[PDB]
Amino acid sequence: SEVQLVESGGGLIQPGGSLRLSCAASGFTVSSNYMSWVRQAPGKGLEWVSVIYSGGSTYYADSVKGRFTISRDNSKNTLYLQMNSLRAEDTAVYYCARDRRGFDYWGQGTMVTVSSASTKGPSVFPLAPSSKSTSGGTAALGCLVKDYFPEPVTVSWNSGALTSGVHTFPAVLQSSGLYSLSSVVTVPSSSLGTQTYICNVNHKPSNTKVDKKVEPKSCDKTHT
Amino acid sequence: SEVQLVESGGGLIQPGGSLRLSCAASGFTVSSNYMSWVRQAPGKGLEWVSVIYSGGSTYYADSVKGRFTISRDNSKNTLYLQMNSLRAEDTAVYYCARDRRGFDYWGQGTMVTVSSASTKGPSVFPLAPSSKSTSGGTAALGCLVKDYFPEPVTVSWNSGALTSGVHTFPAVLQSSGLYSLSSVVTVPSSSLGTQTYICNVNHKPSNTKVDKKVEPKSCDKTHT
Amino acid sequence: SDIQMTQSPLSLSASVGDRVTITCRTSQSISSYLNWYQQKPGKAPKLLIYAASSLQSGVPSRFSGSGSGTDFTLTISSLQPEDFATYYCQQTYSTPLTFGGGTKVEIKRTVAAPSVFIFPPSDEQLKSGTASVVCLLNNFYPREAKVQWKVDNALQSGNSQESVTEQDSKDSTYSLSSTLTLSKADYEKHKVYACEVTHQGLSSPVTKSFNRGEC
Amino acid sequence: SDIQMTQSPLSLSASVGDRVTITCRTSQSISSYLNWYQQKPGKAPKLLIYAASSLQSGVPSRFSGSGSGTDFTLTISSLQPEDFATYYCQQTYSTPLTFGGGTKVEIKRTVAAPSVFIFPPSDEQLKSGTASVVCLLNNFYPREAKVQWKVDNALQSGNSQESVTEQDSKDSTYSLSSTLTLSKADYEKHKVYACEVTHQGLSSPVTKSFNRGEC
Amino acid sequence: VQLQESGGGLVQPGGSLRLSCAASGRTISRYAMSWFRQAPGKEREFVAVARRSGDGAFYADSVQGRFTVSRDDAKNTVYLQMNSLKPEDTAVYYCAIDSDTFYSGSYDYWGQGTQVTVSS
Amino acid sequence: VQLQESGGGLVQPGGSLRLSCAASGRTISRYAMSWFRQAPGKEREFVAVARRSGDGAFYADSVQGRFTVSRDDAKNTVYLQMNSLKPEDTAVYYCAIDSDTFYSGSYDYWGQGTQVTVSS
Amino acid sequence: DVGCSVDFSKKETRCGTGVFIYNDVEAWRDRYKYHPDSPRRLAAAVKQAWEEGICGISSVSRMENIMWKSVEGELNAILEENGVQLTVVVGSVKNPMWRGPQRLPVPVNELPHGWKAWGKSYFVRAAKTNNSFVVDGDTLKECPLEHRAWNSFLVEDHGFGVFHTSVWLKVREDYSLECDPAVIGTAVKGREAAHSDLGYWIESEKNDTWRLKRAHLIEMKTCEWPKSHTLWTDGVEESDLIIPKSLAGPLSHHNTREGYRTQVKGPWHSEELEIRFEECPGTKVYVEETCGTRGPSLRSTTASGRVIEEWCCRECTMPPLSFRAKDGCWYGMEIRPRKEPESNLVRSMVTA
Amino acid sequence: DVGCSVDFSKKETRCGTGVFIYNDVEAWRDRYKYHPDSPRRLAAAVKQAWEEGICGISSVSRMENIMWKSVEGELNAILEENGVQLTVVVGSVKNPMWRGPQRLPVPVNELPHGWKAWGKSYFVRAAKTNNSFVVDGDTLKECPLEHRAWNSFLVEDHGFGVFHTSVWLKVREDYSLECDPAVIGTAVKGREAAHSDLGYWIESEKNDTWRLKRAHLIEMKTCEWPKSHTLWTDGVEESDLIIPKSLAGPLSHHNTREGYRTQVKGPWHSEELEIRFEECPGTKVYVEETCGTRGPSLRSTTASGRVIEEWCCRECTMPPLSFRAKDGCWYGMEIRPRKEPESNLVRSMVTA
Ligand SMILES: *[C@@H]1O[C@H](CO)[C@@H](O)[C@H](O)[C@H]1NC(C)=O
């Protein structure tokens, strides 16, 4: 078969837990080559973890000394990494690479998440179009989705009938262990009176589906 | 010349930092006898950390393996322990001890604190006496201190003029990384209306001194 | 796997002049490496009896112990005033050098019941969007008791912390304090707060409550 | 000691048909063990140039590199639409096999100013005891910009989080949204909330504001 | 699970008596048991509790130095010894079994109780 | 600190002209520089900006393909070459300096308006 | 340093300089004799130790025991001539040699008088007295384990002009759990290595990656193998050392094998043992996923003489790991019988 | 396996059995008959290497260079039978032998022609062509470093000493950074041990926790010493290996010295070097707190014959590390000149 590396064994683990990653290999034997583990955090560069020579010697990156351990099974031609005492800062995508005269082969990767937060439907608060955002016959409106877990969240407007001039911002992770998101859209001012604009939210890992129709703030002074 | 193990190198360190501990010795030579470091967590028992034989070998606990390293300066009979990648759970009191038959010698200890906070004056709230804590002519009035750092305050009453009946609960740590305690004193009812009572809180590192006067309530109409 | 220790009993009651049996079990035969340490709060542990039958130099001659196999034992001939502390054992056969859990030796007295109160969160604190609710138990014995929180007859859980003092030096009772913290947005959702108590000294539960907004 | 692998420039702008130059630098002579990888958003890296002068089989002939000692270089003769990615350099001389700091090449595109907006917190969020603010900048170029939050003309700091959009596919412009979160007890103290904007394509800053509870 | 108590009677001051408590359907070796009394028209009050082996039992202030309690797992029975009685002891007595952990102080089952009287 | 612009004058349509910005206090070798113009009866508008050597320069939408910037770190001076001028471009021109980095982009100092007119 | 080195591999005569292993295990007493320090100070030590109730030292190594049952007589004579009342005794050792807690002391001075070494000293006989300082022996009921001694002697020099070794020794003043370094040697040359002790001879080879080849064990110590005399002490954990770390095994990749873990319940009581990676006669070790889990070592010969011809296991690199003993062939923990119950077969003594 | 020895401190002599390690450096070895596969296959490899941009070689070890030099003529004569116009040109070697990013390939086919490569009876000559295939020398300009090869031969057998002294080689089939195993041997006896190969000889002593005693160096390799052939690997960090890991130093606790760190700026350009811990002639290595900081090794002998006596340092522990070379005395990085300038002297060209 073609030369490839295929990892497996990712998931969600509480802090202090443990996990073991497997990177199979094909087309060549791990025993006569130099193999490594490489990881990249979401939104950052590449980093090298460990290496196991063909003579059996192994070296590890400082940040993972003690906690990690690299080994191989010569019968099934497999490359193992042992992950003990998982931290929160150990979130990344992990690759295995082969060195011959340069890391000329790579694997697709596998995602490892370390979070103690408890799973959850989102909170949706509409953003009201106002004269502040109205200028030259065009106005902007949106919705706000907050405090959900886990990913992924999907946002659409008017059941997908609206597909232009609409932006969905990247998801952020809050200090509370939950994600946040925002969505905005621009529309001509005259369409506000007849065109009913709503924002649909879906969060499948909690079986939650929400919808919200957006209006300008109503100021009928019924206070007394 | 006598046997006395003496540690040093304690303090406060933020997560991810590094620190080096040094257990000097006297009266005997380190290289001729084994050595170890021992730690006790807050409100918990004893646990073993490492050992360095006389011939050179060394062993480490399975939890701090890798992040830690033990060594000795054979030229000055010193016993070093070096820590990197510290965490919050690494708080404890650490000891260095010998091993001949049993752990027949222990040192004195030093405290290691790991927290990302800064020096925060205490918040003082009075517990005014009421019918809710009075029984048989004696009533309890106290003060509440909250959200401070570093180690707890030294509470007092009437600047030492009052000497009997004072209580001070042990401090506790909140999930915000700050301390808490309660103070209470019991006095005869007749002294409520004729004797002034003041609770003093002092927080030496922050140069913060507060005098709070505790008095019975007043539901009288004095809003304006 | 490694070799494990298991002390017992975790806490024992016995008046001065008594005799107490203490066991320190290990998981597999370790010959006769057994050690006994005495630590008093705020001090480094010290060693009394090693080698499972030998006595350290300078130790008073009232301690002793023995055992064979995986089961060992220690005893004090006649408890004196100086023995109010906790004791750990250990092995020194093969690394790791496991220690023992611990034991507490308690002074002896008779059964007493507490006094149950409750406090309201001062309105001044609500100007900062926080509300602390406190329940109190006073001067009871022995150490072991139970308290819980109920609001509108609903059972609270996982949002409170306790604080228990040590033994009183004169009457030898214990005081327990519990705090329940709620934000101003949650504090005004409910009407009545209550605290519950049950202990060996009472034949039925004791309950108290205070309603919101009473000065 | 390890070997540092600085890269430059962090990002560069060049259109189709241009000739681009990138530089990777190392802290000591690594012989001629230098590698160049091309990673596109959300994909694994792949190898272009090894040995500092050699060409991996299959790579198109517009790629070339050179240099000796601590200074190497890479060049593309005629940049093309499909080469919008990031470039990492690496050395496989001695462990640890360190990587480079990355550089992003803007294959496309002239100068525009942003459109500024603001939103007030909806009341039903105040039923939970907290409020959030939003400020939006739409369709500006180049990527550099700045946004600050001011309340009653007082400067906030360290309590707002901002998110950016990827270069717009059809028009090649960015968008930035900054969200500020405060507790209700703090949200009700103030009177004026505003957003401040700054850009190289603007002569003077821009401002938007709203009054608390304004309807 | 059901319980029964027997051993009451009338005795002169300074006499002696031995009360017993028994249960069916539960093995008490794992649990402790509680002893209670009740004066005429008053609420039931605590007397004593018998713990597992090693921990013995704890006695109320009034009975300490006078009464004694003992347990027999093999016969599913618990006994109480009364000495140096005085007219004040007159009250109905009850026995109950606690939960397996003494922290709760909660009782799973209760006995019927019987009268005990002392007169001069 | 003071800046000084030079190169003002008059030119017929279709001509060309060159101007210079000189500064003091800060060294130009590390900092980018920008110009601005204001036509009669209208508000100031961005014209062009030049970054450090190799960092390039960016031109507005209107002046694209007509103007071009240059700088001299050694002589502490910056020039613009204007070609294909037309009467519309008449406006007072200014020269201002930026901060340490383009990610900051806050203008520190500004020059003195110099007259430029195109007519015939 | 110069040596013959008739290279049997290439049939090549050689000469030069270097370092040479010697397999001094098999030719045990054709080469080695052992005598202690001046028995007067040893007598003083045993006197100053009896005050603390020492029963008497159990030997760690056959050398120590064979010195014990050689120097008794003049030790007794030196004790008697000084007026001391004590009788030293010695018996027959039993494998394994367990770890006794106590330690011998070291006298600060010798007795002022006593020279009974002179004349016909070894052969003076006297009646038995009330005090027994029992060394080894079947006195396990007479004296509980906790009062014995262990590992109280060091080696300093050996080699003498008597055509046999005269290993000098003396009492230890230092606590230690480590095996003796003076009589241990190891080396590697190309594709061969050897870990060697006076009772242990362990051979390792490079097939694919280093591994264990053969071991010859005449005694079963219980001291710890030092690290400085070990090859490749890195990246290895105790769960795989075939020879348990507690029974004086070395911590190395050369001391491992694929498909096997530490052998804690091996026949560590036998008189003589050799570890050979070959099947026991009349047997064949299968590998199957359905076999049972680990258990005590089972001899291949029934008490009546019958042998079993089927064994299985799950994780072993087939076929054998066997111990060769004087009374039969012992298999490994991971290999267990396929049809016969473990009840009928002779089972290893409790050595957990 | 069989042989003898003779000790020096004691005169006891004995034959026996075991494992034998020999020193093979001081005599610079004898003259041997190398057999690199079939020199015809090596020639085909030299062609296919030129076809793909390989234009030279830098020797990894002096044995490799000497084999090249001794087979140069037949290499040139072996290709002329077919359509190949290469011309090997072998020069002298320089120290250290910097590495090469390329690797000689492994041909799958061979040039079909006569077998006359080995031992042609004189009369071998060839005609010089335009383009060379250089090997070492001053041919840097003709073939830049990045197009050179390095470390592509693997020993297979080196016996036949009685009648042929034939050493056989091959072209290795896989990438690697570590030295050749087959020529490495190490041994330990009690208080001493040694690591060595064809050009490396390293000695260690048990003073306290073991240390480094002496080492003799005739070449400056730049491979990495395998870990299976070293003593007490774990617990050590590469910042304290006296012979840098890049110059094929081993990772060991025997490979170090208290007070000194890795020596990466040493005189690794001399032809022959002896590592010895002792003060050089006329030198007085003080210990001072005001002394300087690490720096490139400075020779004790000036190009004019002048020498500098007084040197100081802070972190050193006596005796001091020094390299003895045919040029003169070279000191270590830690010990800097006490008062004399660090630049008005024969400074080691930076060997970082
Ligand atoms: C020995 O080594 C070879 C190659 O190193 C390997 O394929 C083989 O399986 C090993 N074992 C045997 C018994 O040949």
Side-chain angles (χ1 to χ4, degrees), chain B residues 64-75:
Chain B
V64 299
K65 190 191 287 168
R67 320 193 294 88
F68 280 45
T69 60
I70 188 168
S71 71
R72 54 201 210 191
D73 170 0
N74 305 287
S75 77

Side-chain angles (χ1 to χ4, degrees), chain D residues 153-172:
Chain D
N153 297 323
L155 177 64
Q156 291 287 6
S157 147
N159 77 341
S160 62
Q161 273 204 350
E162 69 298 13
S163 194
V164 187
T165 319
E166 292 301 341
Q167 182 162 252
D168 194 6
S169 59
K170 270 174 191 8
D171 311 341
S172 189

Side-chain angles (χ1 to χ4, degrees), chain D residues 97-111:
Chain D
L97 317 186
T98 49
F99 277 79
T103 281
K104 193 166 190 67
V105 185
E106 167 196 337
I107 317 306
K108 37 168 59 67
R109 202 170 170 154
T110 68
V111 178

